[PDB]
Amino acid sequence: QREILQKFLDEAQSKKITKEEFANEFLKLKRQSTKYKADKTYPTTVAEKPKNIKKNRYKDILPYDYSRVELSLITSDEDSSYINANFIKGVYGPKAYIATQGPLSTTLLDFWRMIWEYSVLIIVMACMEYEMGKKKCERYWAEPGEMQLEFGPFSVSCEAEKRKSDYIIRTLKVKFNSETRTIYQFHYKNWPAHDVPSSIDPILELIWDVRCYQEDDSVPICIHSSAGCGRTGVICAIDYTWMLLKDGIIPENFSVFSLIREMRTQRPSLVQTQEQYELVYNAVLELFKRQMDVIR
Amino acid sequence: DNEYTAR
């Protein structure tokens, strides 16, 4: 491992990646997903049902069937099984990450159903309510002072808001019929759909923080942006890479390309821009750096 | 009708 990393590091130092390179790199990824439509490799038939088609915030952003997060917790006669969400495999097993879109008004209740069903503790919001004029996500959380917001049978209040330098940790209390849970919502603002931060540093603090609350894959961690692809992708790719590092199992053939390619067969369009692709690269190269430290 | 893509 110590030698795997310093090799990785010395090559990166030895050959800088250019913008034209990263654009060539990212085009390959766009090509593969386009070859998945052509070939019908991963049908999106459930999402395409007329009963489901308006539950999708973006019409070309349709979850694959085989990896879709299915709902079965019933709270009314109108409760159905569809949400725009995919499981993404972690280092050790399936269902490490739930990648979903920002809820619409008609899917706020779906959202909470999903959270509750899968015993999610952690919610990562890589998104703002408004972005370039447009509504990007509806309010499913509660703030301090507001008491309990009501989503169907779910009652959502907020104990504490920790305002950190670049995101907020909201401690949510979610009552469902008789039982109460705590969910940590990590809310990262000033990062639009796609643009990118700087530095890479807040994003690594955020993932560092998240992993303090849940170090394992016992339950899915929920990651969402507006679409559930872009900013979402960035976070899953970075978190997954950091797990490989921290447990000292980064392979010799390690590739940011390959990881992202693999994630993209599970939730469509994960990491949506070459700039976001670069961000995951630079973030990963910073993590390797910090892992050499942990060795020394 | 409503897209994403994207970028």
Curated annotation (Swiss-Prot), chain A:
Domain Tyrosine-protein phosphatase: 22-287
Effect noted on mutating R261Q: Probable protective factor against SLE; severely reduces phosphatase activity
Post-translational modification: Phosphorylation on Ser-33 by PKC/PRKCD abrogates its ability to dephosphorylate and inactivate the SRC family kinases.
Result after altering C229S: Decreases activity 7 fold
Intrachain disulfide bonds: C127-S225
Modification type Phosphoserine: residues: S33
Chain positions recorded as substrate binding sites: S225, S226, A227, G228, C229, G230, R231, Q272
Effect on the protein upon substituting S199F: Moderately reduces phosphatase activity
Positions of the catalytic residues: S225 (phosphocysteine intermediate)
Factors inducing expression: By muramyl-dipeptide and lipopolysaccharide.
Function: Acts as a negative regulator of T-cell receptor (TCR) signaling by direct dephosphorylation of the Src family kinases LCK and FYN, ITAMs of the TCRz/CD3 complex, as well as ZAP70, VAV, VCP and other key signaling molecules. Associates with and probably dephosphorylates CBL. Dephosphorylates LCK at its activating 'Tyr-394' residue. Dephosphorylates ZAP70 at its activating 'Tyr-493' residue. Dephosphorylates the immune system activator SKAP2. Positively regulates toll-like receptor (TLR)-induced type 1 interferon production. Promotes host antiviral responses mediated by type 1 interferon.
The protein's assembly and partners: Interacts with CSK. Interacts with LPXN. Interacts with CBL. Interacts with TRAF3 (via MATH domain); the interaction promotes TRAF3 polyubiquitination.
Family: Belongs to the protein-tyrosine phosphatase family. Non-receptor class 4 subfamily.
Record's protein name: Tyrosine-protein phosphatase non-receptor type 22
